[PDB]
Amino acid sequence: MMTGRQARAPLQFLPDEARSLPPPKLTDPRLAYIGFLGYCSGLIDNAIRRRPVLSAGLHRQFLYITSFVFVGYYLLKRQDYMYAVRDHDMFSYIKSHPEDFPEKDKKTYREVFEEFHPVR
Amino acid sequence: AKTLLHQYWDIPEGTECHRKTYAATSIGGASGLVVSAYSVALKTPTSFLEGVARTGRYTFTAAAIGAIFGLTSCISAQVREKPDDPLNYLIGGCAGGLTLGARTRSYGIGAAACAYMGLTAALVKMGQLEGWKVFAEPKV
Amino acid sequence: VAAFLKNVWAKEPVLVASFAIAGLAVILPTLSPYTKYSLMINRATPYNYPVPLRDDGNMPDVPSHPQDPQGPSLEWLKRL
Amino acid sequence: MNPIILIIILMTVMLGTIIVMISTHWLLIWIGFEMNMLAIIPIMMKKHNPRATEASTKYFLTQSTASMLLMMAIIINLMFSGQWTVMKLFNPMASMLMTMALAMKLGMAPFHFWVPEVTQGIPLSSGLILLTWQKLAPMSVLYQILPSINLDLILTLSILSITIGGWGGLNQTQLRKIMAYSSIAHMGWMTAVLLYNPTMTLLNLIIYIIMTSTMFTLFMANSTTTTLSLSHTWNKAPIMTILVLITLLSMGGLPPLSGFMPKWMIIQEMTKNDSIILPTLMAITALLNLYFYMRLTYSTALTMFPSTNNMKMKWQFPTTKRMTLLPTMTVLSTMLLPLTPILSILE
Amino acid sequence: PGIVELPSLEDLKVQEVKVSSSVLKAAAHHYGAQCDKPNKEFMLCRWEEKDPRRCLEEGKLVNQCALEFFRQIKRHCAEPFTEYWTCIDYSGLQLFRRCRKEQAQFDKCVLDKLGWVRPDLGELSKVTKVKTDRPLPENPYHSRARPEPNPEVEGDLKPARHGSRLFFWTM
Amino acid sequence: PFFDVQKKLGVDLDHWMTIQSAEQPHRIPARCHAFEKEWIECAHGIGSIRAEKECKIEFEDFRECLLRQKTMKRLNAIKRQRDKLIKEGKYTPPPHHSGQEDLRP
Amino acid sequence: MMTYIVFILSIIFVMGFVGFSSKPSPIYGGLGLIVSGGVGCGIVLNFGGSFLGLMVFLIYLGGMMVVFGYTTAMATEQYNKVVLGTFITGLLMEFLMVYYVLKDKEVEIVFKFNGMGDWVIYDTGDSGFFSEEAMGIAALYSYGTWLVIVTGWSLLIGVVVIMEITRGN
Amino acid sequence: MSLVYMNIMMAFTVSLTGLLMYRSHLMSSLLCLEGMMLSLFILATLMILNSHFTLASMMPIILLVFAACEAALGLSLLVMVSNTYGTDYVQNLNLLQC
Amino acid sequence: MNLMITLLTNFTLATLLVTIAFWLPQLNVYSEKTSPRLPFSMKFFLVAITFLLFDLEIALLLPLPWASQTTNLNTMLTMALLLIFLLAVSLAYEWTQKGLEWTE
Ligand SMILES: CCCCCCCCCCCCCCCCCC(=O)OC[C@H](COP(=O)([O-])OC[C@H](O)COP(=O)([O-])OC[C@H](COC(=O)CCCCCCCCCCCCCCCCC)OC(=O)CCCCCCCCCCCCCCCCC)OC(=O)CCCCCCCCCCCCCCCCC
Ligand SMILES: CCCCCCCCCCCCCCCCCC(=O)OC[C@H](COP(=O)(O)OCCN)OC(=O)CCCCCCCCCCCCCCCCC
């Protein structure tokens, strides 16, 4: 859909116009869920090798959590960037085409006649 | 086989019965030739005569389904005088289902084919009425 | 390294000659003074017609006749 | 095989897929498919039994036929356009030939007839490569030629893929044939939404690669190739039955699991374009896939089939197999549905 | 589309150079030295107009200059030239290297009687400059009006309004 | 997945063989160099949807340069009418179309 | 008649493909593909592809069909109604195509095709002291760097692949 | 278009339908596949010489080299099949039905 | 044209000599002489495939006398030495994994 936008400057994970956007907080609940995915990956990794699930490899569980949070931060940045590009292109297309988005006259319900269907 | 469907659908319902019957018979015969071609493709018959027998049997089966479908639907549209009505294709679909039960020599297959093919022909009629798209052109 | 080189020249002289000739073929055009003249002869071979330029008024390096002094010369190719 | 030669051959497979992905010329596309096929043939013949030679021969014949039809489509493109740019095709006959060639390279129905045979004939790792990595290059070309693909053709191929991949696994007990019919049905799901929103095609491709990679890694970690050998997993490593349970309930498209995400976004982008009957038949036909998945889960995790006495010796040994990324692939294939608007990174 | 506009047969009549290719090859270097200017005006007109119908007068000047060149050869040095192009004409590939003494005779008589100097190695392959009086062609490809491009993007990139707007995901 | 690595890294891997109007060895033009240059400079940047409708004329001229279908159709019409008039005896070929006229140069 | 020489060689080309595609045996199938490669080489040579036609005779017919006949000798014993019937079916379909396009000077099998000889579509210029096709093939080294890299790597990998899969271990 | 293009396309379809209809042998299938390659070679060459597109003169050689390496790979598969089963018959390759 | 005449003349002389060699010893009507899979080598196939792949590498190498006329001589010389080097690397790998054995 938006392939003509990311074709003048290809393979940019985050362009220079992605920096005008606010980054995610470190208490972004999506990033906290990705950290929960990392902790679950650590627990499954202790389970399938028949280690103690909570105890064994606290360094390894911590690297699972850290790695998923580190990847997920940039994935959330690119998510926010692509939705901001989508809204920006939408609004510029509505602005550059007034004849295709006419101002529809809002009529109040004193004028709006609606058919009544009795429930009996 | 797109122009077969064109020369089927363009004719008004309950006006020209023999032409609609032959158009649906041609549609059914073409579909039976397709089913026969894949059946002799994936499965080798024991000779040439058995292969052309299976080909002619499936082709005449689907042609009889199409013939009795179009005939029953046009006669129902004539005796009910409701041309844009899916009950006509419901009766036509159950007639084609009883036809498939006669050809496959089994009653329960005919009853199930009555029910499911009648609902299918009703759905096709309602798609012709409200303009339902199965291969919808991309718009957004 | 010289005992192994004499060993492989005693056992397999064909392969030693092969790797020596291939080594010369790899490294020697970077050390030759005449590798430049190969390029200079190939680019100065006129396969096409020398399509002239519209004389606007200031092109002193482009000649107006073939026997004019300015322009690219091939005295180096006549002499070498 | 020599490990150095194995690494060089796997880099050649990856290089052929990358040459299809990055190149702007049709001859380099065809070169990338040739390189990919030529290097993946020894991976299929790793064990040197007659089933691998049969599978590699059938794979060679189908991919060679597809590559020749692809070069014919490229040649008719050079006829009717005088150029070689990898973009839309300038002739509907070249579009039909290239769509057939890419459908053969995917193994979509009715050209599906090599996929369960070749998948059963070769090992689980080479089957993993065949069912995940080899789907990347033809879907890249289909992503690149979508302004010229005939809609009726690609939707016929998609629904025929979904129906045949649904009815195929219902008769199967061998795990590789089940994964291959699952592949046929899921490639039908991917190409059904191609001309509507190819971002959802890439989403379905990534989620399917994660789930299939999870299932083949579980099959390699348990060394089970049949349903009945997969049944003894509860007496050997009981966490694996939980993992195959959650992954098979994911692959059926059951919420709240992330295998529901692709087909739900595909229905979400097909109803926008006023297609209601077609995603309805797709969603109803996915119940066949979910039925043979539920057959596997009944045989493996929800009940306990009888084991044998020699399992007591295997109780005394750990899994020394490199279960590479299996917890990562397990967590991504199940618990990714709250992160569903991450699909915008594929725009 | 439009009717193609061809010149008449009287616009194409010119006195031909009815000599063989070995005759043209023998005096080729003196032809390049002496008939430089109208030939280069013609080839500049030919690479700029990109139409042979726009080059007929320049081609006629080329033909007139070539005819005057061979008439100026024939009045003074006809017999060493005939001796030279016969020996060029004998060879199949028509080598210049096979006929250096007849070339020396022809070049000697030409330098002594006509003052022409045969060009050195490299000279005829020079890119020269041409003083023309015709205007520069403003659109030789007859290219019509180009389509206007799509509008570019502009403005600071504001955040997405209420996130993704994907059914219930508030971010 | 058109990972445009050739534009990200700035390498020319296969852009050179892509079109006929590219840089050729020894400056050899194709038989439809001008038509393809006109169609490319028409369709550049405007997108494929706008190029299907706004560059139809240049593309039809370029396709008819490549395949010469209208040209061969017109020559078929002229030659068939010529052979029909020889059949009817209403026409005779001129001496410049019979090989008895001592060609130009 | 002689102006239609590429068309005559192309009809011989189609007749040879109908010949070996009927598949009487891989021996005579290889012979039919050899005769077909020879006449298709003649088709290439009559447009001016002298180097590419000698690439047919030297590489295709010179190495590859030699390896096909070599393997046919070594993996098949030393040598019907269906073969001859499909042969005469293909021959009658191709001669009906010839008859249609020679009686109408126009045909449409899948696309539209002219009925005159293909001498009409040639250029009316020269290429100077070079062949355009020869210099374009010489451009494989100067302009075609990446193409040489991927082709030479695919051949190296192909040697590696055949030594792996024919080993049987 | 040109009349010879019809014949080279029809030759490709003949070797297609021969490759798409096996009789007994695998070598006949590989011969039909390389006939398909031959028709591709001829048709690409006639387009490229027809258009005087200089750079694509190296294209049919690359087609030839890649698909002849493909032919060598298929002959090696045929050799392994014939060493397993004794013949190159395609009806011996039937163990993947179960 | 002259080539086609020469090819047809060579084919005609060959066919005439074959007809003489088969039919002239059938004039002298002699006596009626009434008295009254193959083993596979992998090495034959490997020398045939090694020939085929080296012939494909030769097919890459054949435009070198035309490639030496280029203006991009550094790139041409590099890719020329690189193709001959890949042919030598194919030969070295064919050596060291016992490919050239018992038909060395
Ligand atoms: C100055 C610097 C420092 C500042 C500090 C500030 C923070 C201080 C607190 C520090 C901790 C922060 C934690 C995150 C923030 C709160 C997030 C939150 O509650 O969102 C409400 C969120 C939406 O409700 P709301 O009232 O509209 O928003 C209130 C706020 O405005 C919510 O804010 P919002 O509007 O911005 O939220 C954005 C959006 C709001 O949400 C939406 O727009 C709706 C869509 C959400 C996803 C729905 C997916 C449905 C299909 C899949 C279902 C999967 C199975 C469900 C769970 C199965 C069991 C695991 O969030 C998402 O879409 C994210 C995806 C869901 C993850 C939520 C965060 C989890 C963090 C902890 C992970 C631990 C495991 C939890 C269980 C895993 C599943 C969640 O609620 C849900 O979606 C319900 C699901 C449960 C949410 C998790 C609750 C977090 C705390 C869990 C502690 C207990 C863990 C027990 C052990 C592990 C499980 C066994
Ligand atoms: C870098 C330069 C370019 C290199 C690439 C181009 C090479 C061009 C020639 C093509 C050669 C292709 C085949 C090469 C195969 C090498 C491996 C080999 O043959 O090893 C086996 C051999 C011993 O032979 P054996 O196994 O006993 O066989 C029975 C025969 N009597 O083992 C040996 O005999 C040892 C062979 C290696 C030692 C040869 C050393 C020659 C040194 C000459 C001087 C330096 C040359 C400059 C280059 C540096 C070389 C290190």
Side-chain angles (χ1 to χ4, degrees):
Chain A
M1 181 176 71
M2 303 194 285
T3 183
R5 181 65 175 267
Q6 290 86 20
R8 282 80 175 268
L11 287 171
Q12 287 175 352
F13 185 79
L14 286 169
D16 193 76
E17 61 185 1
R19 301 181 73 187
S20 295
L21 292 171
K25 296 181 181 180
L26 293 180
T27 62
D28 194 0
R30 298 175 293 172
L31 187 63
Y33 179 72
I34 300 166
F36 177 71
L37 298 183
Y39 185 72
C40 290
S41 295
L43 297 177
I44 296 172
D45 188 76
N46 281 320
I48 63 170
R49 290 177 174 87
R50 293 181 71 250
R51 293 192 292 267
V53 176
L54 294 172
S55 296
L58 293 173
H59 67 287
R60 189 179 297 112
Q61 291 175 351
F62 189 70
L63 185 56
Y64 270 110
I65 294 170
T66 300
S67 67
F68 284 15
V69 171
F70 184 77
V71 176
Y73 182 74
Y74 296 103
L75 293 180
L76 291 175
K77 288 182 75 178
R78 183 167 171 84
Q79 174 183 356
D80 292 334
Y81 170 70
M82 293 307 294
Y83 287 119
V85 166
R86 197 270 313 274
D87 284 334
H88 184 269
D89 294 333
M90 188 194 302
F91 293 157
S92 69
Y93 190 79
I94 295 167
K95 183 173 72 69
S96 68
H97 291 84
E99 70 272 12
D100 288 325
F101 298 94
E103 188 173 3
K104 181 65 176 66
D105 288 330
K106 293 173 70 175
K107 288 172 69 176
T108 57
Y109 286 99
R110 64 188 293 273
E111 296 90 3
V112 175
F113 178 73
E114 297 178 357
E115 180 180 0
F116 175 70
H117 300 279
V119 176
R120 66 170 71 99
Chain B
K2 188 179 176 67
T3 188
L4 278 301
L5 274 68
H6 280 87
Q7 70 184 3
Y8 180 76
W9 283 101
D10 291 333
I11 301 167
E13 295 291 327
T15 61
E16 190 178 3
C17 186
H18 293 87
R19 181 64 66 195
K20 288 291 290 295
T21 301
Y22 182 72
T25 310
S26 63
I27 290 169
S31 297
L33 285 173
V34 172
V35 173
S36 295
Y38 283 104
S39 181
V40 305
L42 282 310
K43 281 88 174 64
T44 303
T46 64
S47 178
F48 184 78
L49 274 299
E50 184 68 27
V52 302
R54 293 174 68 193
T55 301
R57 187 177 66 243
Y58 294 163
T59 300
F60 181 73
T61 298
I65 291 170
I68 294 172
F69 172 73
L71 179 61
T72 306
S73 292
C74 188
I75 292 300
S76 65
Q78 288 177 356
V79 302
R80 293 181 68 250
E81 292 179 353
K82 288 173 93 287
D84 53 355
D85 180 68
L87 187 273
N88 294 319
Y89 283 0
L90 181 59
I91 298 175
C94 186
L98 269 294
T99 302
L100 192 272
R103 295 295 296 160
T104 57
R105 272 74 176 174
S106 59
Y107 290 93
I109 300 300
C114 163
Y116 287 101
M117 291 177 70
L119 295 177
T120 305
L123 287 169
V124 170
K125 186 65 174 69
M126 298 167 195
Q128 194 269 332
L129 289 175
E130 278 85 3
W132 294 348
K133 294 296 290 183
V134 48
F135 291 161
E137 186 71 26
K139 63 182 290 293
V140 304
Chain C
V1 67
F4 174 71
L5 189 63
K6 187 178 74 66
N7 194 4
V8 69
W9 179 245
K11 293 188 288 184
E12 292 291 327
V14 171
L15 294 173
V16 174
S18 299
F19 284 101
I21 290 168
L24 287 177
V26 171
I27 68 101
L28 198 60
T30 64
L31 277 73
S32 178
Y34 292 159
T35 307
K36 183 178 87 275
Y37 291 105
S38 299
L39 177 62
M40 291 175 69
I41 291 170
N42 282 320
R43 68 173 63 252
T45 298
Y47 293 100
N48 291 319
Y49 185 75
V51 178
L53 301 175
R54 182 184 292 272
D55 195 0
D56 53 354
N58 289 318
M59 290 188 290
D61 292 332
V62 175
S64 295
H65 192 271
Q67 296 184 357
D68 290 334
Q70 65 272 16
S73 176
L74 292 180
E75 294 292 329
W76 61 269
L77 180 57
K78 294 176 71 68
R79 267 70 178 173
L80 290 165
Chain D
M1 192 183 289
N2 192 1
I4 297 297
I5 298 301
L6 179 64
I7 288 170
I8 294 297
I9 282 171
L10 289 172
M11 293 303 108
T12 308
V13 174
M14 291 178 69
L15 183 64
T17 303
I18 288 166
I19 286 167
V20 180
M21 285 178 180
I22 72 168
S23 65
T24 69
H25 197 278
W26 285 110
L27 186 66
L28 273 300
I29 296 294
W30 184 74
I31 280 169
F33 285 114
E34 288 292 326
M35 183 183 289
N36 194 3
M37 174 184 66
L38 181 66
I40 201 175
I41 287 297
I43 304 298
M44 300 178 189
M45 291 181 70
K46 188 184 285 185
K47 302 301 289 294
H48 296 286
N49 49 358
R51 290 176 183 267
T53 64
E54 180 181 358
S56 299
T57 303
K58 293 182 181 182
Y59 183 79
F60 176 75
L61 290 169
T62 59
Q63 298 303 112
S64 296
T65 309
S67 182
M68 296 297 173
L69 291 175
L70 181 65
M71 180 53 75
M72 175 50 74
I74 288 166
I75 277 172
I76 302 170
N77 193 11
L78 191 70
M79 279 180 179
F80 287 87
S81 67
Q83 52 87 31
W84 297 93
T85 314
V86 180
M87 61 180 180
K88 73 179 292 177
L89 297 177
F90 287 89
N91 200 10
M93 182 65 198
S95 296
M96 184 186 74
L97 284 171
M98 191 171 291
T99 305
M100 293 300 180
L102 295 169
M104 291 177 70
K105 284 182 181 291
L106 295 173
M108 291 176 62
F111 302 102
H112 66 280
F113 285 115
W114 61 271
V115 189
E117 285 82 2
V118 178
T119 308
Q120 179 63 38
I122 67 175
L124 292 168
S125 67
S126 62
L128 177 56
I129 299 172
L130 189 151
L131 293 178
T132 59
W133 182 260
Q134 299 294 314
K135 303 293 184 288
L136 292 178
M139 293 313 293
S140 66
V141 183
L142 288 170
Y143 184 84
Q144 289 158 355
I145 67 166
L146 64 90
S148 290
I149 298 173
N150 195 359
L151 180 69
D152 294 335
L153 176 59
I154 193 68
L155 291 178
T156 303
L157 289 167
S158 297
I159 64 97
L160 194 61
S161 300
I162 291 171
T163 57
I164 289 171
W167 281 294
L170 298 178
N171 203 3
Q172 301 299 324
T173 58
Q174 303 293 319
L175 295 175
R176 288 173 285 177
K177 288 186 178 180
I178 292 172
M179 297 306 293
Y181 285 113
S182 177
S183 180
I184 299 161
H186 287 85
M187 296 313 297
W189 280 99
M190 297 180 202
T191 65
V193 77
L194 176 65
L195 301 185
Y196 302 112
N197 191 1
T199 305
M200 305 302 169
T201 295
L202 299 179
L203 183 67
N204 193 4
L205 182 61
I206 289 173
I207 299 300
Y208 179 71
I209 283 169
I210 293 171
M211 295 187 291
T212 313
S213 301
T214 307
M215 286 304 291
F216 275 95
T217 304
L218 288 164
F219 290 167
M220 290 182 286
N222 292 318
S223 294
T224 63
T225 59
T226 66
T227 300
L228 196 63
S229 63
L230 184 64
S231 69
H232 291 173
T233 312
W234 69 271
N235 203 8
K236 181 179 181 291
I239 186 63
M240 298 295 173
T241 58
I242 298 171
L243 300 185
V244 302
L245 176 67
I246 59 173
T247 310
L248 285 168
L249 294 176
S250 179
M251 292 183 73
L254 286 175
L257 299 174
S258 71
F260 177 70
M261 182 195 296
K263 60 179 69 176
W264 169 49
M265 289 293 106
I266 287 169
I267 294 170
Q268 192 262 336
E269 288 288 327
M270 286 180 71
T271 58
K272 290 184 184 294
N273 289 306
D274 292 331
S275 66
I276 303 299
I277 300 172
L278 196 64
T280 299
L281 267 70
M282 286 158 61
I284 292 300
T285 315
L287 296 178
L288 284 71
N289 293 112
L290 182 52
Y291 183 74
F292 58 81
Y293 292 157
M294 283 297 295
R295 177 177 290 168
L296 292 176
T297 61
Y298 282 175
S299 65
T300 303
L302 291 170
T303 55
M304 301 188 287
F305 282 3
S307 66
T308 60
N309 200 12
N310 290 320
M311 193 65 69
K312 296 184 177 66
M313 193 179 292
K314 288 193 284 187
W315 292 350
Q316 302 181 0
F317 293 98
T319 62
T320 60
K321 296 186 181 69
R322 294 177 65 189
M323 296 176 284
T324 298
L325 292 175
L326 181 58
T328 302
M329 293 182 291
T330 299
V331 171
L332 288 175
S333 67
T334 61
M335 291 182 280
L336 195 61
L337 190 64
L339 298 171
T340 301
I342 210 72
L343 57 88
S344 66
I345 74 177
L346 299 174
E347 286 287 330
Chain E
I3 306 299
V4 60
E5 185 68 28
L6 297 175
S8 67
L9 295 173
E10 295 292 328
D11 289 329
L12 297 172
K13 289 184 183 293
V14 68
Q15 185 182 1
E16 296 292 327
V17 178
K18 297 291 291 295
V19 304
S20 293
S21 68
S22 64
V23 181
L24 291 176
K25 192 178 176 67
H29 290 85
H30 296 287
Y31 180 73
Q34 296 301 111
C35 303
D36 187 20
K37 185 183 287 185
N39 286 322
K40 292 291 181 66
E41 288 173 353
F42 172 68
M43 300 302 268
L44 181 61
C45 186
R46 191 65 177 84
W47 263 272
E48 286 190 354
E49 293 290 331
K50 297 183 186 297
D51 192 356
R53 300 173 295 175
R54 301 280 76 78
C55 299
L56 294 176
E57 293 293 328
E58 286 82 3
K60 289 179 176 67
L61 291 177
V62 163
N63 209 155
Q64 182 180 1
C65 191
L67 287 171
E68 183 66 30
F69 178 75
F70 288 110
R71 291 187 187 98
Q72 194 177 4
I73 285 177
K74 189 176 181 180
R75 290 188 299 273
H76 294 87
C77 56
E79 295 293 327
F81 179 72
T82 301
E83 182 182 1
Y84 176 55
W85 72 260
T86 303
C87 296
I88 295 296
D89 189 69
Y90 182 77
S91 181
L93 288 171
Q94 292 176 352
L95 279 307
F96 283 161
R97 67 178 178 92
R98 295 286 188 182
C99 302
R100 296 297 182 186
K101 61 181 290 294
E102 293 88 3
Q103 181 178 356
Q105 291 291 323
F106 175 70
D107 294 335
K108 182 72 173 177
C109 183
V110 161
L111 182 64
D112 289 329
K113 291 178 71 67
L114 292 170
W116 302 346
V117 177
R118 184 175 181 271
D120 294 332
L121 190 66
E123 293 186 355
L124 292 173
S125 66
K126 291 176 183 178
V127 174
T128 62
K129 62 183 181 291
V130 175
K131 182 68 177 66
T132 54
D133 294 333
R134 65 175 180 87
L136 194 281
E138 71 276 14
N139 194 0
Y141 293 95
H142 294 290
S143 66
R144 63 171 183 170
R146 288 287 184 260
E148 291 293 328
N150 291 316
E152 289 84 5
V153 295
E154 70 268 12
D156 288 333
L157 191 62
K158 300 296 189 292
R161 288 186 183 177
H162 307 290
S164 65
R165 291 177 283 152
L166 186 58
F167 288 108
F168 55 91
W169 275 277
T170 66
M171 293 185 73
Chain F
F2 180 67
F3 297 108
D4 198 2
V5 174
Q6 302 179 2
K7 193 175 187 294
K8 180 69 173 178
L9 298 181
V11 294
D12 191 1
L13 292 177
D14 58 356
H15 298 287
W16 53 272
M17 205 200 290
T18 305
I19 59 173
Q20 295 177 358
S21 297
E23 181 180 0
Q24 302 291 320
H26 302 290
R27 296 288 181 265
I28 300 165
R31 288 178 64 188
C32 299
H33 177 76
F35 289 95
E36 183 161 353
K37 186 264 293 295
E38 285 293 324
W39 174 65
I40 289 168
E41 289 185 353
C42 185
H44 174 72
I46 64 171
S48 172
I49 303 168
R50 291 186 64 236
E52 286 293 324
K53 61 179 182 290
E54 298 179 357
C55 298
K56 185 181 262 77
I57 290 173
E58 290 87 3
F59 183 73
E60 284 180 355
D61 285 330
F62 172 61
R63 176 175 287 173
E64 205 271 328
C65 182
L66 288 173
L67 293 173
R68 292 296 176 102
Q69 296 182 357
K70 295 178 185 177
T71 302
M72 289 187 288
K73 183 178 185 294
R74 187 176 176 88
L75 293 171
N76 282 319
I78 294 170
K79 184 178 181 292
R80 188 175 67 243
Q81 183 67 38
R82 180 176 180 269
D83 288 332
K84 183 173 73 68
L85 285 176
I86 300 299
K87 182 69 176 293
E88 292 182 354
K90 288 170 67 176
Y91 178 72
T92 182
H96 63 269
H97 286 169
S98 66
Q100 295 296 110
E101 61 98 20
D102 199 4
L103 275 297
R104 174 66 73 89
Chain G
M1 180 266 171
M2 192 62 73
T3 64
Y4 292 93
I5 190 66
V6 186
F7 175 68
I8 292 168
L9 289 170
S10 70
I11 297 307
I12 299 166
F13 188 75
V14 181
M15 287 170 66
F17 278 25
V18 174
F20 77 93
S21 69
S22 68
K23 299 175 289 294
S25 179
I27 295 168
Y28 295 102
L31 184 273
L33 185 53
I34 287 160
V35 174
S36 299
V39 295
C41 173
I43 298 166
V44 164
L45 287 164
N46 286 315
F47 285 14
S50 297
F51 187 82
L52 292 164
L54 289 175
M55 288 305 105
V56 175
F57 274 122
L58 183 57
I59 307 304
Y60 187 83
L61 300 175
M64 193 189 75
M65 293 303 293
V66 175
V67 175
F68 275 103
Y70 195 87
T71 310
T72 307
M74 185 179 61
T76 305
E77 185 67 30
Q78 57 271 14
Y79 183 69
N80 298 116
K81 192 263 182 181
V82 180
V83 171
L84 192 146
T86 312
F87 179 77
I88 59 95
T89 303
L91 265 288
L92 285 174
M93 291 300 172
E94 185 63 29
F95 281 119
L96 263 292
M97 288 172 65
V98 173
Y99 180 75
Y100 290 167
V101 76
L102 268 295
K103 70 177 288 295
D104 287 333
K105 299 294 188 291
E106 190 272 331
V107 76
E108 185 178 1
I109 301 298
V110 180
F111 304 110
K112 294 173 72 175
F113 296 101
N114 193 5
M116 287 180 68
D118 57 354
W119 61 270
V120 294
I121 58 176
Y122 292 177
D123 197 3
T124 61
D126 56 353
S127 66
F129 279 104
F130 52 88
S131 177
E132 296 173 352
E133 177 255 335
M135 289 293 103
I137 292 167
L140 178 63
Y141 295 91
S142 65
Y143 289 165
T145 303
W146 174 247
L147 200 68
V148 169
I149 290 170
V150 298
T151 306
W153 181 256
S154 296
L155 288 167
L156 180 64
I157 289 301
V159 175
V160 172
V161 161
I162 302 305
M163 293 184 73
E164 289 293 328
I165 68 164
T166 59
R167 180 179 59 195
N169 298 117
Chain H
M1 46 224 231
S2 181
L3 179 53
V4 64
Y5 292 165
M6 180 183 74
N7 295 318
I8 306 301
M9 285 182 179
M10 187 56 70
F12 181 80
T13 61
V14 163
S15 59
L16 184 72
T17 61
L19 186 273
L20 272 296
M21 296 179 72
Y22 294 170
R23 287 183 65 250
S24 298
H25 293 90
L26 185 62
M27 189 68 76
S28 295
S29 304
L30 293 179
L31 287 173
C32 293
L33 187 68
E34 299 299 319
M36 292 168 71
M37 184 270 281
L38 176 61
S39 66
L40 292 176
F41 187 88
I42 305 303
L43 194 56
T45 303
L46 302 184
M47 284 190 288
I48 291 161
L49 299 172
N50 207 171
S51 298
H52 288 178
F53 175 42
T54 301
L55 285 172
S57 295
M58 72 184 80
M59 176 266 168
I61 301 171
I62 299 301
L63 172 64
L64 180 67
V65 167
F66 273 87
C69 185
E70 182 179 6
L73 190 273
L75 286 171
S76 299
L77 266 303
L78 189 146
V79 158
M80 295 307 294
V81 167
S82 178
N83 288 320
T84 295
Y85 294 97
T87 59
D88 58 352
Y89 290 155
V90 295
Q91 68 267 14
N92 290 320
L93 297 175
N94 56 1
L95 294 175
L96 294 173
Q97 64 178 356
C98 64
Chain I
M1 188 65 202
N2 300 115
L3 173 62
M4 294 189 287
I5 292 168
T6 310
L7 291 173
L8 184 63
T9 306
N10 292 318
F11 178 76
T12 305
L13 181 63
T15 309
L16 184 62
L17 289 172
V18 166
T19 300
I20 293 171
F22 282 107
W23 290 94
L24 182 69
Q26 199 173 3
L27 287 177
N28 43 4
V29 179
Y30 291 112
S31 298
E32 187 67 28
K33 276 79 178 177
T34 65
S35 178
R37 204 186 73 246
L38 77 162
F40 185 79
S41 179
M42 189 61 74
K43 296 173 284 184
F44 288 164
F45 186 69
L46 264 297
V47 71
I49 295 297
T50 309
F51 163 67
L52 179 58
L53 295 171
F54 286 177
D55 187 69
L56 293 173
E57 291 168 348
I58 288 166
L60 298 178
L61 287 177
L62 282 168
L64 287 177
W66 288 340
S68 297
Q69 296 295 320
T70 190
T71 313
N72 196 358
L73 280 175
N74 288 320
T75 304
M76 174 264 168
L77 181 56
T78 304
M79 304 314 286
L81 298 177
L82 185 64
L83 278 180
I84 307 162
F85 177 73
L86 285 175
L87 210 159
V89 168
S90 297
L91 183 61
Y93 184 77
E94 190 74 29
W95 194 295
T96 61
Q97 299 296 320
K98 299 296 182 182
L100 300 176
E101 290 295 327
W102 289 347
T103 66
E104 288 88 10

